[PDB]
Design a protein around this ligand. Structure first.
Ligand code: MOV
Ligand code: GDP
Ligand code: MG
Lengths: 157, 168
């Protein structure tokens, strides 16, 4: 029952059915439920670009700082997917800007590696450590140099 | 340390994410997000030497992705993973191989054929056909099973050794 309801909530968040998400939340589902890897409904809602589902989960009490088995918070997924509205909403709710995953990758590092300039500048505006170092000794500037993107290097400087 | 820029390519549901997670965290994920594409860094010991593996789990169906194509061009080895219980994936392995050949624009590209889901007893792709395809392509074939974590390390080490042989 509880597991099935949580799985239905996760599937509704992944698919992008706001009505189904609202109905499942009204039916007793858990906003902090995690799947096998650890993706909470907020993780999937941020990953798949459903701003309304993200807002509903945040209002209902979703753990915004929760992380999956690899330490990736929903901010990490929203940054790696290049969702400007989602990252702005997550930062507006006090998400851990300098959060670290199992490799110690700041969401700034993920946004730089993917190639999302707007996400990078938005994260920097809200206090993102440019000098942040992962577990392998690579910063955002190093990632920009490796990618060779001149615009990313200009923004990071 | 040597940073090997590995890539893992294949069809949907073949187990690329499962293999990568088994290598990185040594635990199998029964269900994983179909469209998660991220790079995992691992410190391994091969032939007594410490090496760094930077493995990309290509799982995005988008036609254009600057990070993905840059990683593919800069990649040094490719794991072509297919499910033995899925003939369609085995057929699409050739399409992935020719796509990688066109992108890299190189005749000799380090590739390793991987047959995932070896634990399942309803095998659909015969081992003989896969071995014949591998020997025709001149690349090793390794059978892996992410659920039991058998052959994953062997497949990754074979890819690394093939990369080293191509470099030398
Ligand atoms: C179920 C989700 C999943 O596992 N996926 C794996 C990645 N993927 C995928 N899809 C896809 O259509 N192509 C592709 C491209 C980008 C261009 C032309 N043809 C194809 C298909 C018909 C093979 C993917 N291409 C690559 C890839 C290309 O194309 C060239 C060089 C190196 C490559 F890796 C790829 F890695 C994944 C592709 C879908 C099925 C989602
Ligand atoms: N029994 C078994 N199942 C597997 C194995 N590898 C992957 N799977 C299953 O394949 C399903 C989809 O794999 P997925 O993680 O999506 O691979 P991907 O599509 O390449 O990212 C998962 O639910 C796994 O249970 C394996 O080695 N053995
Ligand atoms: Mg995947």
């Amino acid at each position: 029952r509880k597991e099935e309801l949580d799985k239905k909530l996760l599937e509704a968040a992944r698919a992008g059915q706001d009505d189904e998400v609202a109905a499942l939340l009204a039916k007793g589902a858990d906003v902090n439920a995690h799947d096998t890897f650890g993706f909470t409904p907020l993780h999937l809602a941020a990953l798949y670009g459903h701003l309304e589902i993200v807002e509903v989960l945040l209002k209902r009490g979703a753990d915004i700082n929760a992380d999956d088995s690899y330490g990736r918070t929903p901010l990490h997924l929203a940054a790696m997917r290049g969702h400007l509205e989602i990252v702005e909403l997550l930062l507006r709710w006090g998400a851990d800007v300098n959060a670290a995953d199992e490799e110690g990758r700041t969401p700034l590092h993920l946004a730089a590696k993917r190639g999302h300039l707007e996400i990078v500048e938005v994260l920097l505006k809200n206090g993102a450590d440019v000098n942040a170092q992962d577990k392998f000794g690579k910063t955002a500037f190093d990632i920009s140099i490796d990618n060779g993107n001149e615009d990313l290097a200009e923004i990071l400087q | 340390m040597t940073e090997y820029k590995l890539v893992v390519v294949g069809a949907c549901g073949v187990g690329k994410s499962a293999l990568t997670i088994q290598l990185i965290q040594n635990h199998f994920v029964d269900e994983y997000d179909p469209t998660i594409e991220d790079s995992y860094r691992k410190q391994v010991v091969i032939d007594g030497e410490t090496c760094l593996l930077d493995i990309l789990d290509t799982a995005g169906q988008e036609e254009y992705s600057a990070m993905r194509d840059q990683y593919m061009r800069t990649g040094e080895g490719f794991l072509c993973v297919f499910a033995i219980n899925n003939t369609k994936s085995f057929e699409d392995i050739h399409h992935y191989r020719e796509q990688i050949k066109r992108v890299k624009d190189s005749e000799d590209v380090p590739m390793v054929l991987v047959g995932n889901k070896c634990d399942l007893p309803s095998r659909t792709v015969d081992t003989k056909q896969a071995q014949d395809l591998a020997r025709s392509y001149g690349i090793p074939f390794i059978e892996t099973s992410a659920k039991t974590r058998q052959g994953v390390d062997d497949a990754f080490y074979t890819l690394v050794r093939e990369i080293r042989k191509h470099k030398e």
